Amino acid sequence: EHICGKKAGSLYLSGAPGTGKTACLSRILQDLKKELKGFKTIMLNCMSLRTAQAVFPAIAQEICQEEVSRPAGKDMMRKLEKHMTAEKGPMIVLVLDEMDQLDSKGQDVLYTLFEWPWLSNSHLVLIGIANTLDLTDRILPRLQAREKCKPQLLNFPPYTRNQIVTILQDRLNQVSRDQVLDNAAVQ
Amino acid sequence: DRTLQKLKRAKLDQQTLRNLLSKVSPSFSAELKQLNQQYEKLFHKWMLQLHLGFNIVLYGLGSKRDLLERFRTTMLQDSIHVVINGFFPGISVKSVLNSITEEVLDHMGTFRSILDQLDWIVNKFKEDSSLELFLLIHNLDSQMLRGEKSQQIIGQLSSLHNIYLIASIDHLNAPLMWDHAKQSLFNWLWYETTTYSPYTEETSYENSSLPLSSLTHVLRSLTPNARGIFRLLIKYQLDNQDNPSYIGLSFQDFYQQCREAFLVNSDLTLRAQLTEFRDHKLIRTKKGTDGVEYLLIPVDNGTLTDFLEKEEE
Amino acid sequence: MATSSMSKGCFVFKPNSKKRKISLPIEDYFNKGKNEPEDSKLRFETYQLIWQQMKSENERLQEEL
User: Where does this protein have coiled-coil stretches (chain B)?
Assistant: First the structure.
């Protein structure tokens, strides 16, 4: 609905603490490349960033694929949000990960990435892959206070025996010739 | 007369209640409009005093920020004017002084301490006699500038007649933020303002209660064995709440109650089930003198009473 | 409004879009209506004459005493 209806907003995915859902989002991203051709998706891997800063310039080198530039020192919050508001460019999709680890003493770095798809020219979809540690209490104080932002929340319940036993039937019976254990040990 | 259990008007809304607040009461609305136009007759009166090194003080009733927004669209189109509306928990002295460096003076930010930037901007407006700057600061008395180090920075800029300061006062302790050593630079000129209009902007820092969606979406993505433990400690909390000496249940009786209600099996596995509760600000441990880690829930007394009614399905 | 629905307070309005650069004096606003426009500018230029001369007397009287 966002790529066809020309819409853009935020989407906070609060996954279960440690369940291995990183491969679920990778399946959807690769299916959109073979369906539609014209858009570009920039990845994010802030595992080597021990500080709260040096995050925006790390993804500033990907402007429009073939058109790149170079940093000049102290130039954020000016050129990154300028190219996003351009209606002549394609719909850029930004992926977010471990957003809880990017906090600060006043989480000021998280006040600019959640207000871009809500001001003029909303052409950015927010996708945050992170487990459940804390909801909207101190990270995003705009909720339960401001009536401008309307985020969406989706949770994932823990898989009981209805899914763990099911995920093993299509795992061993499709690649092995004969099972090595009985059905009583699976339960 | 007690907590929040006698009245059914619990859980105050934040965004789902502004739909019914737009229908205001038109009680003598004609007399309130002409009161605002009474101050509009003195349009060409502010520039006759601000150019001599004076300021404008705004006090009284009504929304002080909803009045200056109309004066800017009538005579502030060709003059260097900067409006400051610092009310959200994040406004400081660094977001205002460093904002006139790469925009007004065109210079990148590279200062060191606080005193290094104060004496650097004075030389730019003292040697040049053609750098006017109007400061339309809204609600100067916020909540994060009560210290004496905040007025001494802006007080130095008031000594020059080329800098115009326009602030609003919404507190009965107006002379509590400045003494005689600072009034010589500002030279406050009091002007009463009567608007009679509520505030629908800065209402966010005040304490509402906690969102009920957080306690509901935390149990859906939780293991089935952990939900029975959370629903067991809430029963023993309200039954012993009448005791004023409630210090919390111990760990020995808590470990015995688990197997009595078919829960955990060992001790190290029980401690692993309390990892997602201490990180979600649900329970915490205290350094007890008896060597026993107490278990309490730092929430409101009326919040736990409304949790047993939503789990009936 | 457009200067309060976000998490920043850096909003400036520099007169740069206009090509011409004009200066508006102070005495041009003393006559807001029918209040002798030819005499409004004559009494304002004397307002600073009687004020800059009394300040020179204050600094002289305070110094001679």
Answer: none
